[PDB]
């Protein structure tokens, strides 16, 4: 099985191609943040919307949400979302899903296929929101480091996030709790 | 709340201090791998030992298992396990847990305290095993890159892992499935 190799190979998939970064970021670091953000968003949404989400399925979906980029590499969203490429890339991503986990035991094989081909729309939505939050957070950190090239990126991501908070109360609560002073200029918790 | 800052600040905590590495590794990359390994180990253990583990709790514990290193930094195991430092470091780690999540809503606050102060011994054991597997895997990748300085590290970690597989059948199965050709010299799944 290539599953363990793929887990470590995601470190060789860089994000933010074409942009200067003070800190390069790979898919494993991004996926770690998305898992943690997805969990936080889930807890807020559960409390606000009066429900319970299957957190095993949510966390496993967040964990693997970008695993196909070990084949596709990470295509940045301005390119992937171009109308010329949007649908072919989604067909490409589906082709990768179909071939990934070849020589696995049926416990892993079906559990991993279940994770990849998830049709829980709500888990997919939470992780999509977490993905946008993480991109905004990265843009915040780069601007904080002094990276003027990320100011316009931060602006467009923050504008889209603002619009999302008008329609998704759990995102507005997340923004209130965490995103109005980010990153922390003084990291008092270290002492 | 400092929770989101901490999630990203784990990227500034390096592992393997004092060892030459061709690729530097931070706690977020390590924790991503440990979450994924913990999940795989859990599925094997469930099938082999005739049980079901609460995978939400396992994954969340793996996600945060090293979060206190944002305060302590990452003390390498030859130092942390020294008899002079072993118990004081565990007391230090307990002091950090007690002060981390100050200004959070009770959904997050208690859920995060529950995660940190977990007393599920089996989840703690799975994550401890996943932590050792990940350290072995890193040593394998460095040796693969050509890093002779990690040969003796790989040997001692592989010896300890071998001994563990004699007592924990799910680890032996993991080793059989993934650790006899790692990393993959030819990454055929990319094409
Ligand atoms: N305004 C922008 N310019 C360049 N890359 C962007 C971008 N917004 C998002 N990305 C990147 O597309 C990825 C998914 O958000 C993100 C990291 O590669
Ligand atoms: N033989 C060894 N020499 C130096 N650091 C080691 C080591 N074995 C494990 N470590 C490091 O201790 C950490 C936990 O395994 C690991 C990464 O920092
Ligand atoms: Mg993503
Ligand atoms: Mg660890």
From Swiss-Prot, chains A, B:
Signal peptide: none annotated. Keywords: Cobalt, Hydrolase, Magnesium, Manganese, Metal-binding, Plasmid. Mg(2+) binds at residues 30, 65-66, 131. Is most active with Co(2+). Shows lower level of activity with Mn(2+), and weaker activity with Mg(2+) or Zn(2+). However, Mg(2+) and not Co(2+) is probably the relevant metal in vivo. The metal content of the active site is modulated through substrate binding. A dinuclear metal center is observed in OxsA-OXT-A-PPP and OxsA-OXT-A-PP complexes, while a mononuclear metal center is observed in OxsA-OXT-A-P and OxsA-OXT-A structures. This is 4'-phosphooxetanocin A phosphatase. The gene is oxsA. It comes from the Bacteria. Belongs to the 5DNU family. It comes from Priestia megaterium. It is an enzyme of class 3 (hydrolase). Phosphohydrolase involved in the biosynthesis of oxetanocin A (OXT-A), a nucleoside analog with antitumor, antiviral and antibacterial properties. Catalyzes the hydrolysis of phosphooxetanocin A (OXT-A-P) to generate oxetanocin A (OXT-A) and a molecule of inorganic phosphate. Can also bind and hydrolyze OXT triphosphate (OXT-A-PPP) and OXT diphosphate (OXT-A-PP), and thus catalyze the sequential hydrolysis of tri-, di- and mono-phosphorylated oxetanocin A compounds, releasing one molecule of inorganic phosphate at a time. In vitro can also use dATP, dAMP and dADP. Oxetanocin A binds at residues 16, 74, 77. GO terms for molecular function: hydrolase activity; metal ion binding. Has a mononuclear HD domain phosphohydrolase fold.
């Amino acid at each position: 099985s290539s599953l363990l190799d793929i887990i470590y190979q995601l470190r060789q998939v860089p994000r933010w191609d074409g942009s200067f970064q003070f800190e390069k970021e790979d898919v494993s670091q991004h996926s770690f943040s998305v898992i943690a953000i997805s969990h936080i968003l889930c807890e807020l949404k559960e409390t606000l919307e009066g429900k319970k989400i299957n957190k095993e399925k949510l966390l496993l979906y967040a964990l693997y949400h970008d695993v196909t980029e070990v084949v596709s590499t990470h295509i940045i969203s301005p390119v992937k979302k171009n109308s010329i490429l949007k649908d072919p890339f989604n067909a490409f991503r589906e082709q990768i899903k179909n071939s990934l986990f070849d020589n696995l035991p049926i416990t892993l094989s079906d559990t991993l296929s279940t994770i990849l081909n998830n049709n829980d729309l709500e888990i997919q939505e939470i992780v999509e929101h977490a993905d946008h939050v993480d991109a905004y957070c990265k843009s915040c950190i780069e601007v904080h480091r002094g990276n003027k090239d990320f100011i316009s990126i931060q602006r467009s991501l923050g504008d889209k996030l603002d619009n999302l908070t008008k329609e998704y109360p759990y995102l507005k609560e997340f923004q209130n709790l965490f995103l109005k002073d980010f990153p922390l200029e003084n990291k008092n918790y270290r002492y």
